[PDB]
Design a protein around this ligand. Structure first.
Ligand SMILES: CCn1c(-c2cc(N3CCN(C4CC4)CC3)cnc2[C@H](C)OC)c2c3cc(ccc31)-c1csc(n1)C[C@H](NC(=O)[C@H]1[C@@H]3COC[C@@H]31)C(=O)N1CCC[C@H](N1)C(=O)OCC(C)(C)C2
Ligand SMILES: CCn1c(-c2cc(N3CCN(C4CC4)CC3)cnc2[C@H](C)OC)c2c3cc(ccc31)-c1csc(n1)C[C@H](NC(=O)[C@H]1[C@@H]3COC[C@@H]31)C(=O)N1CCC[C@H](N1)C(=O)OCC(C)(C)C2
Ligand SMILES: Nc1nc2c(ncn2[C@@H]2O[C@H](COP(=O)(O)OP(=O)(O)NP(=O)(O)O)[C@@H](O)[C@H]2O)c(=O)[nH]1
Ligand SMILES: Nc1nc2c(ncn2[C@@H]2O[C@H](COP(=O)(O)OP(=O)(O)NP(=O)(O)O)[C@@H](O)[C@H]2O)c(=O)[nH]1
Ligand SMILES: [Mg+2]
Ligand SMILES: [Mg+2]
Lengths: 163, 168, 163, 170
């Protein structure tokens, strides 16, 4: 059975709500395991306390940089970066969970959640999950984004783990 | 990809341009007065079946900066003209904003919506009737709003999107 | 005699340097006294710890909101607001120190420092001082401003008083 | 008031567009990679005894979005065309940026400066004379820069301003 993880989101320290993700371990086991482990913190580091540094209404909410907290960092449980596992799944609509990268085979910990279909990212970013509950939480997060992604409020993963 | 609309909120200082915009974007009400330099906002919405992307410019109504407003008016497709129903001066300024818009755009036919804001307040110096008669003269919709209570906010912006759609 | 005061300016907590001002008590005694007292804190409140919330390169640096720390607040030693003392002095060039306001006779604690001639503010904002030492610190603060004034790092008055 | 100059920094990914802009604005060197969406900056400078306001647009070089450079190219007054002297492809990409600028502005006469960045690096694949010859053929200046050492940073942006002043006949 595919694992499920959760983020508890906070805006400037104030609870917003819980969003849960199904991670498609059946098609991308390596990429899903990295996200799962970073969500539990079991390797001694992970998403807890990190912020969503880039939110662009109409497209996606991007986060996952827990090493530098400025959108340049992050690391995987396999090392700083690891290879593109596969591109079987597509960015078909809101709720899709997919890996940020800086080109081929540069997956770290940064991820983005689609608020719309983003088909031109197919074959360039590894899709590995989907919002299970709390899409409206993600939509509420759009209220604090901007055209170039800078957020007007601090959007944090106040707690996270596996369900 | 979703269609993009460029809205511009105009009116005198303190009428509630930003409070209306923030209420539409963030479902939040600013009870303090933070006068605007200039702010741009992005929001995705579904209007009359069409998903679209709203680009909203929140402007400053200071008279000294009229020449700067011209650039706002060149790029913008539609204009939310806000006055406050307890502020007769801001109601009289509406004529001037409309004139400036008309001039810069070289057109009598520019999507526009008159907004009487702060309709929650018990004091009132601009009657609904006066603003109706003015809007009718101009040939544009008129909506009374209260950013404090959220009354009419979505109607004002979506009505403007519709006026642009009809215009385009 | 015209008193002199100083701000010790910090950037994200890191000390930047000292700016001192001459206050024109010989032309606007009421306005100079207010700024002087808020710089020493002798009335129990003032600029110490407050931030420069609006920096627009090529125009001015604005601060002084110590009651709300969001650009809408501040208060004078005479109450919430006091009248425009006069408009004898003008915004002639860099270094001018003048009062922020929200219409006639709404001076509180908010102030701004010109980095260039802003003559369209003459007759509307009460000029009451000028930078004496540390204009280079004011120029450096522009490094962290933007077109609409939002700052990219937190500029604070770490210390202040009278010389 | 002071004259405002609208400068746009363009070039392939990773050449140092943002590093150069941040050195100009904040006088320090971003050693980490923060790939740009879009960023605008303001700085007042003195150039040839005159104070002027620089408005710098830092752009994304991603090939996926080349068909959307139209907007910022139309409003920019002058363009810093940046390549990295250790990346031949970035040098070859210059041709495409210049042509696209000329097309959008519908002009063969657009203020531009050719910038060869990363000149602190020992692994150069594009020769100075190579780039000089190209700029000569374009009729534009060429400046070698290092965002790491700050070499040529001021010179590149100021030379662009001077180019814009010329094209305006002012
Ligand atoms: C041209 C403007 N412009 C747009 C864009 C585009 C459009 N459409 C394009 C599509 N058309 C459809 C077919 C019709 C219509 C017009 C409209 N309006 C815009 C914006 C708002 O105009 C300002 C974008 C965009 C993106 C970039 C640069 C410029 C961009 C960019 C830089 S780096 C990257 N992209 C990948 C990045 N990598 C890192 O963050 C690295 C950091 C360090 O190492 C780990 C870590 C990454 O993986 N992601 C995870 C995934 C989403 C992605 N970020 C992102 O944010 O894109 C934003 C956006 C808005 C989706 C695209
Ligand atoms: C149209 C854009 N635009 C400009 C402007 C203008 C120009 N020129 C003007 C001159 N032309 C020459 C004749 C040829 C050419 C075009 C160029 N570029 C710009 C900018 C960068 O484009 C965004 C400005 C400006 C100013 C405002 C709103 C919009 C503005 C504004 C809002 S409120 C206020 N101003 C007074 C405010 N009050 C409060 O904050 C209240 C808060 C609550 O209660 C206590 C407290 C206050 O006292 N100050 C302290 C003093 C400077 C002042 N803020 C401020 O920030 O001005 C900024 C700026 C840039 C100097 C002016
Ligand atoms: N009772 C009431 N008060 C309101 C309403 N909307 C705004 N206000 C208050 O009126 C004041 C002005 O609000 P603001 O939205 O900041 O005004 P603006 O019209 O954007 N001003 P500027 O042009 O100077 O940027 C603030 O204190 C705000 O809380 C409303 O619908 N009802
Ligand atoms: N040695 C050296 N490294 C540099 C120089 N300029 C930039 N770099 C490095 O090169 C990498 C890319 O730099 P960046 O400024 O991020 O590039 P861009 O040209 O803005 N890229 P994009 O189009 O993706 O936004 C970063 O690691 C940066 O530190 C330079 O002059 N010398
Ligand atoms: Mg406002
Ligand atoms: Mg960049």
């Amino acid at each position: 059975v595919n694992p499920t993880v959760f983020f508890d989101i906070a805006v400037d320290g104030e609870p917003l709500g819980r969003v849960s993700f199904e991670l498609f371990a059946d098609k991308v086991p390596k990429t899903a395991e990295n996200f799962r482990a970073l969500s539990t913190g079991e390797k001694g580091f992970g998403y807890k306390g990190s912020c969503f540094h880039r939110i662009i209404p109409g497209f996606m909410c991007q986060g996952g940089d827990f090493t530098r907290h400025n959108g340049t960092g992050g690391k995987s449980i396999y090392g700083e970066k690891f290879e593109d596992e596969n591109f079987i799944l597509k960015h078909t609509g809101p709720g899709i969970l997919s890996m940020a990268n800086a080109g081929p085979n540069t997956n770290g910990s940064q991820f983005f959640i689609c608020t719309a279909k983003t088909e031109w990212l197919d074959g360039k970013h590894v899709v590995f999950g989907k919002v299970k509950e709390g899409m409206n939480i993600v939509e509420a997060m759009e209220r604090f984004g901007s055209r170039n992604g800078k957020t007007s409020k601090k959007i944090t993963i106040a707690d996270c783990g596996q369900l | 990809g979703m269609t993009e609309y460029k809205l511009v909120v105009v009116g005198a200082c303190g009428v509630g341009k930003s409070a209306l915009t923030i209420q539409l974007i963030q479902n939040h009400f600013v009870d303090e007065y933070d006068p605007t330099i200039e702010d741009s906002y992005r929001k995705q919405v579904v209007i009359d079946g069409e998903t679209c992307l709203l680009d909203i410019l929140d402007t400053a109504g200071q008279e000294e900066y009229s020449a700067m407003r011209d650039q706002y008016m060149r790029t913008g497709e539609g204009f939310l003209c806000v006055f406050a129903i307890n502020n007769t001066k801001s109601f009289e300024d509406i004529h001037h904003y409309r004139e400036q818009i008309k001039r810069v755009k070289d057109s009598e036919d520019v999507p526009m919506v008159l907004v009487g804001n702060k309709c929650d307040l018990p004091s009132r110096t601009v009657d609904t009737k006066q603003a109706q008669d003015l809007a009718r003269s101009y040939g544009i919709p008129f909506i009374e709003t209260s950013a404090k209570t959220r009354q009419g906010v979505d109607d004002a912006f979506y009505t403007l999107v519709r006026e642009i759609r009809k215009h385009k």
